[PDB]
Design a protein around this nucleic acid. Structure first.
Ligand SMILES: [Mg+2]
Length: 684
DNA sequence: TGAGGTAGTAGGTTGTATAGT
RNA sequence: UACAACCUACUAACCUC
């Protein structure tokens, strides 16, 4: 191996192997009347396990248990969606389960988790939300405190052992009223909860009215209203507070500040504490992870926790290329781009002012100078409020070779931002916005805005230097919408990643991307590779954001086999990787950690040393490229994103682009994209 | 809208098996 | 439901370049 080995700890701990009585759970038969539906079987079975109590989990069509039937509610009644059923439990003995059998250890682990939860529920000083445990004051001020603990998990090995997952976690509690909060000179919090229940509102403003005078729609005083329900007992109705239901933050509602409690944010605390942060340096997290794990092991009698370790790998550093070797995409602004064509940019200024800021102009001229490419800056002399007659100023601009526009503007309301984006997109003109109180020392901002303006004009700013198995990398994501998704793809064309492009996403009902939309988009990207390389990819790298729905790539994978194209399919989850800590030494990004076959973690980015990194968890779902070669290429693709400039995304450029793309399309809509070259990354 | 990201609180989504015969 | 993978608002926050 040409890669440097390192050992790592996972945030998992090995515990004792299950004993006989744990391997052979009480079985039970479930007799539900009226007999269940089909989509309603498991949900009711689970609500029966929960209604029977003890360490009980559903198992198949009946239930498993680590509790004696003599402490189980064997007869009962539960109310599901509309219908009221009655259940009965028939102790079918005690069959043993086998940890190798996937759904059997699925049951063993289910029971482990329920056990852990019950052991936790009985602990005295601790606060326990589900599997989260908070046990120690971490910070505090007048009226508030922050509790520290950890989220946990207990499951069963393939080899019959208990497994503990631990990750330090915090909870912010405010137990003071709004009145006191505001009386200590702090600012209004954006959200606020009822003091007498969980109902939570957005806090609009404070009221000038008198509680005892404010007539409540159909009845009494604000004060008299609340008094009625006995809420002023042991409390002091404060001032008038106008709040709103977050679902429709229009219609204001009267409330009293003595009966509201602030919902706090880290910044509401930064007014007080200032030096309080909730993320941890990785070594601190590792330490507390170990302490808490030992603490639980000691409250659990499942042995002494032995931190599980894995073999990690230092991946080769990606060689990023501008015109010359580069270390971050912003450096391309000084050295030149990987491949720059002739370009024409336009300016839309929407403050009172006029013309290109000289430093931007010079930065651009230098970059194209350095790149050995011609540049022609234009300036739109028209305003959006000229209604549509400015579309014609837009018409002019496309008839001279303008590939993208800079909008120099005051901060825009989201609505107007979209209105404008759309408006310029109709004419196939991607826009980069730059907020206009702007000064040359705000360098990372205008240089990122510039890098984005350039990606949006179709320039390739950086590429990789290296030989990778796949000559085509395409990432698939689903949706930038609520009740339905979009599902689209983006593209790193060439082994150098010499080209990036996007594909029009297609409206769909949920996560799963229709098999045929998958193959369609893929085909679009095959056409791209073909028409710039004159040949078909020998191998493609297929990437999904998140879990991959059952055989949703099947049609496309078969289409690929047919056309004699080799391929790999990787599922890239942002969650589920847990944690990774060096046994010795520092931790740098580029970490590759094999877990089972078909799966591995990748610590792709580390940079904000006040926080702890979250490895991606990746599953090799199809294909037969060595795990290490996939890791290597994913890792390098992380560095290919043009629009970030000073920090790399945690996701590989195609998946990060696909994400940005379906969020933009979900935001602006799908219309107005007919006239946009797919090489202009309009959405970064 | 500069961009990347770790941490919170409060409120949401889809995806899987699940029978009958 | 849990489990699994996610989204939104607070967040143009906070930290970092
Ligand atoms: Mg952008």
């Amino acid at each position: 191996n040409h890669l440097g080995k390192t050992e790592v700890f996972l945030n998992r701990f090995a515990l004792r192997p299950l004993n006989p009585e744990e391997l052979r759970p009480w079985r039970l038969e479930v007799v539900l009347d009226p007999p269940p539906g089909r989509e309603e079987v498991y949900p009711l079975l689970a609500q029966v396990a929960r209604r029977a109590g003890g360490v009980t989990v559903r198992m198949g069509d009946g239930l498993a248990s680590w509790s004696p039937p003599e402490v189980l509610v064997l007869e009962g009644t539960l109310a599901r969606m509309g219908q009221t059923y009655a259940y009965r439990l028939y102790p079918k003995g005690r069959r043993p389960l086998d940890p190798k059998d996937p759904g059997e250890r699925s049951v063993l682990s289910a029971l482990a988790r329920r056990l852990l939860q019950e052991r936790l529920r009985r602990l005295e000083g601790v606060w326990v939300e589900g599997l989260a445990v908070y046990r120690r004051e971490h910070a505090r001020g007048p009226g508030w405190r922050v509790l520290g603990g950890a989220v946990l998990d207990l499951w069963v090995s393939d080899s019959g052992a208990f497994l503990l997952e631990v990750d330090p976690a915090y909870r912010i509690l405010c137990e003071m009223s709004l009145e006191a909060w505001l009386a200590q000179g702090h600012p209004l919090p954006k959200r606020v909860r009822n003091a007498y229940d969980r109902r939570t509102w957005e806090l609009l403003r404070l009221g000038e009215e008198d509680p005892k005078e404010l007539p409540l729609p159909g009845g009494l005083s604000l004060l008299d209203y609340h008094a009625s329900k006995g809420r002023l007992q042991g409390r002091e109705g404060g001032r008038v507070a106008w709040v709103a239901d977050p679902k429709d933050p229009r219609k204001p509602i009267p409330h009293l500040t003595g009966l509201l409690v602030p919902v706090l944010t880290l910044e509401d605390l930064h007014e007080e504490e200032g030096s309080l942060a909730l993320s941890l340096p990785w070594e601190e997290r590792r330490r507390r992870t170990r302490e808490i794990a030992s603490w639980i092991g000691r409250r659990l009698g499942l042995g002494t926790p032995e931190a599980v370790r894995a073999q990690a790998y230092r991946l080769s550093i990606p060689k990023l290329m501008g015109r010359r070797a580069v270390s971050k995409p912003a450096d391309a602004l000084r050295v030149g781009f990987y491949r720059a064509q002739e370009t024409a940019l336009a300016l839309l200024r929407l403050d009172g002012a006029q013309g290109w800021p000289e430093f931007l102009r010079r930065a651009l001229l230098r970059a194209f100078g350095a790149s050995g490419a011609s540049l022609r800056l234009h300036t739109l002399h028209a305003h959006p409020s000229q209604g549509l007659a400015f579309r014609e100023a837009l018409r002019k601009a496309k008839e001279e070779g303008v590939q993208a526009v800079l909008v120099l503007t005051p901060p825009m309301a989201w609505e107007d931002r979209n209105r404008l984006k759309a408006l310029l997109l109709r004419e196939g003109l991607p826009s980069q916005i730059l907020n206009v109180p702007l000064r040359e020392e705000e360098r990372h901002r205008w240089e990122n805005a510039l890098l984005g303006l350039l990606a949006k004009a179709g320039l390739q700013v950086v590429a990789l230097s290296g030989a990778y198995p796949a000559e085509l990398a395409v990432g698939f994501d689903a949706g930038g919408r609520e009740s339905f998704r979009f599902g689209g793809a983006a593209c790193a064309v060439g082994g150098d990643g010499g080209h990036l492009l996007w594909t029009l996403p297609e409206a769909q009902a949920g996560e799963r991307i229709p098999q045929e939309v998958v193959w369609d988009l893929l085909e679009e990207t095959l056409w791209a590779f073909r028409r710039k390389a004159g040949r078909l990819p020998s191998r493609v790298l297929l990437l999904r954001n998140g879990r991959v729905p059952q055989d949703e790539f099947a049609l496309a994978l078969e289409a690929l086999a047919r056309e004699g194209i080799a391929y790999d399919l990787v599922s890239v989850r942002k969650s589920g990787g847990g944690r990774v800590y060096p046994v010795q030494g520092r931790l740098a990004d580029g970490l590759y950690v094999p877990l089972e076959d078909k799966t591995f973690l990748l610590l792709t980015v580390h940079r904000d040393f006040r926080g702890t990194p979250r490895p991606l968890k990746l599953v090799h779902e199809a294909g037969d490229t060595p795990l290490e070669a996939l890791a290597h290429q994913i890792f390098h693709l992380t560095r290919l994103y043009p629009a970030s400039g000073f920090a790399f995304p945690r996701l590989p450029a195609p998946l990060h682009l696909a994400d940005r793309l379906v969020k933009e399309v979900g935001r602006l809509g799908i219309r107005h994209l007919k006239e946009v070259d797919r090489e202009k990354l309009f959405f970064v």
